[PDB]
Amino acid sequence: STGSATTTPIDSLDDAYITPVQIGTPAQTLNLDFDTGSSDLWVFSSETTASEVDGQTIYTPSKSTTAKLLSGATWSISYGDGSSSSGDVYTDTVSVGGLTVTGQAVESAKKVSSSFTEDSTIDGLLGLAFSTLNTVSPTQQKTFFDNAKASLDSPVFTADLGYHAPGTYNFGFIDTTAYTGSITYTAVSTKQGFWEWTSTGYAVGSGTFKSTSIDGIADTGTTLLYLPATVVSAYWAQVSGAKSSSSVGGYVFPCSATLPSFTFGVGSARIVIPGDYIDFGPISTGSSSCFGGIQSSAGIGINIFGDVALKAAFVVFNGATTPTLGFASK
Numbered sequence: 001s002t003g004s005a006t007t008t009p010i011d012s013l014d015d016a017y018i019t020p021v022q023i024g025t026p027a028q029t030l031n032l033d034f035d036t037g038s039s040d041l042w043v044f045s046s047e048t049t050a051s052e053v054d055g056q057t058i059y060t061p062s063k064s065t066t067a068k069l070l071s072g073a074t075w076s077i078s079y080g081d082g083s084s085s086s087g088d089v090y091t092d093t094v095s096v097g098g099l100t101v102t103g104q105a106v107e108s109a110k111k112v113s114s115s116f117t118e119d120s121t122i123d124g125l126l127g128l129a130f131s132t133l134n135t136v137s138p139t140q141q142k143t144f145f146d147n148a149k150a151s152l153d154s155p156v157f158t159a160d161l162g163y164h165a166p167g168t169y170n171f172g173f174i175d176t177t178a179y180t181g182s183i184t185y186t187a188v189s190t191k192q193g194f195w196e197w198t199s200t201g202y203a204v205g206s207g208t209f210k211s212t213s214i215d216g217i218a219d220t221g222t223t224l225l226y227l228p229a230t231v232v233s234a235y236w237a238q239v240s241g242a243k244s245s246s247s248v249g250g251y252v253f254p255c256s257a258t259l260p261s262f263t264f265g266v267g268s269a270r271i272v273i274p275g276d277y278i279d280f281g282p283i284s285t286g287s288s289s290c291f292g293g294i295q296s297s298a299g300i301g302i303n304i305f306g307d308v309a310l311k312a313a314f315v316v317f318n319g320a321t322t323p324t325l326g327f328a329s330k
Contacts, residue, residue: 001151002172003099007034007161010121013280014307015223017161018121019169022095023106024064030057030123034169035221036159036195036317037304039133039143040077041094042085042107043124044116052112055120061108067092075107075135080222080300085112089136094144096126099171101148105134105141125221128157128317133193145171145319155319159220160330161311163277179314179328184269188323192302194219195317197325199305200267202227204235205260209270216303218310218317218325224280225262225273226297226304235262235294242292248283251292255282262294264309266327273312 007017018031023043030043044053046060061067067090076086087110094104109124116122127134131142149155152172160178161167168178189196194217201211214227232251236242238260242253253259259275278293293308316326 001099001148002153002170003095003097003148004168004170005097006166007169008166009162009164010119012164014161014164014311016122017167017220017307018123019096019126021126023059024061024092025066026064027095028057028059028064030059031121032124032126033122033221034126034128034159035219036128037217037219037221038077038079038125039127039129039131039193040075040107040135041105041124041126041144042075042077042087042109044112045087045108047087048109049111052117054117057123059106059108059124061090061092061106064092066102067106070105070136070139073105073136073139073141075137077135080304081115083113083115085109085116087111089141096144096171097169099148099152101144104144104147105136107136128220129195130190130193132190145317148172149319157317157319159310159315159317161220161307163274163311167311174316179330181329182269183314183316183326183328184266185316185318185324185326186266188325190323194302195323195325200265202231202265203263203270204238205275207238209263209265211265214264214303216297216305218315219304219306220310222304222306223308224304224306225294225308226300226306227294228303229296229298232294232296235260236292244296248289248291250295252283252289253292255288255290257290264305269327271309271313271327271329273309277308277312
């Protein structure tokens with residue numbers, strides 16, 4: 001089997017991407033944030049504290065003839081951005097782009113943190129990291145991909161995120177029309193439950209490539225590119241007037257600037273992030289200070305190849321017995 005679904009930016013900045021997901025019978029379609037940095041499929045629901053729901057579409061398990069309470073199971077998750085959610089668990093039929101999993105754990109939120117409430121466009125998350133990170137207790141549950149994998153034509157999914165435009169998540173096949181040149185594959189460590197890999201270096205604009213190993217995670221659920229402070233300083237030094245602002249929470253730059261590109265290495269291959277991808281616009285409405293899309297990972301504890309990086313590539317998440325990651329230009 002295969003599946004193919006379009007993923008759509010939630011706003012003009014590509015702060016996140018939503019993908020429609022069918023849950024239950026008859027289908028209830030929710031727009032979920034596909035997150036290769038976590039491993040829970042959770043949704044706003046009829047059980048979510050009413051004051052914490054503000055415009056989201058909810059899953060109502062009592063209206064699904066295939067929903068079953070997973071007795072005794074609870075979940076609770078905290079994300080790197082400080083947000084969180086928790087609740088109980090149903091199993092139900094879940095379909096993405098024509099690919100159907102029966103008996104998928106659908107984690108129903110009883111509580112969500114304010115950032116989730118305040119984002120009316122995201123109805124929940126669909127985790128695509130390794131199932132070892134799944135938070136369901138006392139019986140850990142499998143991700144949608146893990147459940148689907150054996151049925152797929154090939155045990156892979158691909159992320160093809162757009163810049164200020166829709167893109168595609170495919171399951172079970174590699175669309176050879178969706179990228180240019182070849183796909184370069186690179187080793188993955190699953191030790192921390194992430195799609196963790198090592199970039200071979202970077203360049204800023206038309207500058208020389210610096211060969212240096214940068215361990216980090218491919219994370220579709222993180223907006224920005226978080227890299228070591230040395231790398232990030234080298235980038236922003238090429239933008240007149242850019243500075244790290246403790247009050248804003250990262251590098252800012254004059255909105256009048258033209259940003260240089262940023263290149264990262266994948267083996268001997270190179271992925272170029274155009275400068276415009278690194279612009280996250282005014283820090284507040286009407287400001288001439290703009291927020292940068294490359295930020296320091298210092299104090300996160302891990303480097304994160306988030307959407308800023310991934311949207312410059314066609315990315316293969318290869319879930320073979322020994323997982324790997326592939327990157328192509330597009």
